[PDB]
Design a protein around this ligand. Structure first.
Ligand SMILES: Fc1ccccc1C1=Cc2ccccc2C2=NCCN12
Ligand SMILES: Fc1ccccc1C1=Cc2ccccc2C2=NCCN12
Ligand SMILES: Fc1ccccc1C1=Cc2ccccc2C2=NCCN12
Length: 297
């Protein structure tokens, strides 16, 4: 991991970056802040290019659409808690998701949003903002304290609270047992496997393929090709980022950056990893984060 850039928040005695993602214009990173600002930075020069107030509480999460026309945000204690913003021409609010603490785009065709409210997943039409679908069954719930509902790559399955759902029928196919209190899990990009904390399950059989103890409590991100997997413990859930070969799950690196981690993300070309680190302790009067960019390839 070769350091390529470092940069804080401009003109802030206390730098308050909390999350990050690559924009559709490579060279430029979008960051959320502890004051609910969305900022655009040149990721090499550290130059702040634009700023908008999205929320009156901290940003926890953001996701740009691929086509560069839309942005999803989630805040901490704001009503509404999550929103969808338009970025074509002018920056403006399209829809709000009143109590959803987390939101993502669909994957294969980006025409829907999936939101989470405690144990319950909500699917929404992007163009109308309607709720199309509520996925919740009280007799299959795991009650994961960090539950984050997510589409599979083809947009026809959802994982919510450790339960696999088939969208077209709105039927629960399978409930994976509970083995931790917090983490509800993600689809592998290959479409064949699910990662729920330290368990990797096959979607053919529901048989355990791998135990990866090092993944305990970790959020997970993939490079664009789906061949490398990064994991870290995140602040929004509460210094070691791990990297794994995404086919066999054997470790490639264990970095200790010496600093608690707020977020990590990949570019579309498998070239860069961007990480938000705090230089402060948690017991400090104030936050002091940096964004670090690493060459990987
Ligand atoms: F949005 C959240 C609200 C509460 C707890 C965690 C998250 C969250 C989930 C996530 C999943 C995969 C990759 C990155 C992330 C992430 N980055 C910042 C915080 N965050
Ligand atoms: F304001 C922003 C806040 C956060 C992220 C991006 C922007 C932004 C920067 C921009 C730069 C040059 C030309 C047009 C634009 C623009 N039009 C709408 C969105 N947007
Ligand atoms: F295996 C099952 C037994 C009973 C019910 C469903 C399945 C199943 C779910 C699935 C989900 C995503 C990708 C592939 C699959 C799959 N491939 C074969 C079987 N199968």
């Amino acid at each position: 991991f070769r350091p390529i850039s470092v940069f804080r928040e401009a003109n802030e005695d206390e730098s308050g970056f909390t999350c990050c993602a690559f924009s559709a214009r490579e060279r430029f990173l979008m960051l959320g802040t502890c004051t609910g600002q969305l900022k655009l930075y040149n990721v090499f020069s550290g130059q702040e290019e634009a700023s908008y107030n999205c929320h009156n509480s901290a940003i926890t999460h953001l996701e740009p659409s691929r086509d560069g026309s839309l942005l999803l945000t989630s805040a901490t204690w704001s009503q509404p808690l999550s929103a969808l913003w338009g970025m074509k021409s002018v920056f403006d609010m399209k829809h709000s998701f009143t109590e959803d603490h987390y939101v993502e785009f669909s994957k294969h065709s980006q025409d829907r949003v999936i939101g989470t409210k405690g144990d319950i997943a909500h699917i929404y039409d992007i163009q109308t903002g309607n709720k199309l679908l509520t996925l919740f069954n009280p007799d299959l719930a795991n009650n994961y304290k960090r539950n984050c509902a997510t589409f599979n790559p083809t947009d026809d399955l959802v994982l919510n609270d450790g339960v696999l759902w088939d969208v077209r029928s709105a039927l629960a196919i399978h409930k994976f047992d509970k083995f931790n209190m917090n983490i509800s899990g993600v689809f592998h990009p290959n479409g064949l496997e699910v990662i729920i904390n330290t368990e990797i399950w096959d979607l053919r059989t529901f048989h355990l393929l791998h135990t990866v103890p090092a993944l305990d409590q970790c959020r997970v991100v993939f490079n664009h090709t789906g061949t490398v997997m990064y994991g870290a413990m995140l602040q929004a859930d509460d210094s070691s980022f791990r990297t794994f070969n995404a086919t066999d799950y054997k470790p490639i690196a264990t970095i200790d950056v010496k600093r608690n981690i707020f977020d990590l993300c990949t570019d579309t070309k498998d070239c860069y990893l961007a990480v938000i680190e705090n230089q402060g302790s948690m017991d400090a009067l104030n936050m002091d984060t940096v964004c670090r960019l690493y060459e990987v390839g």
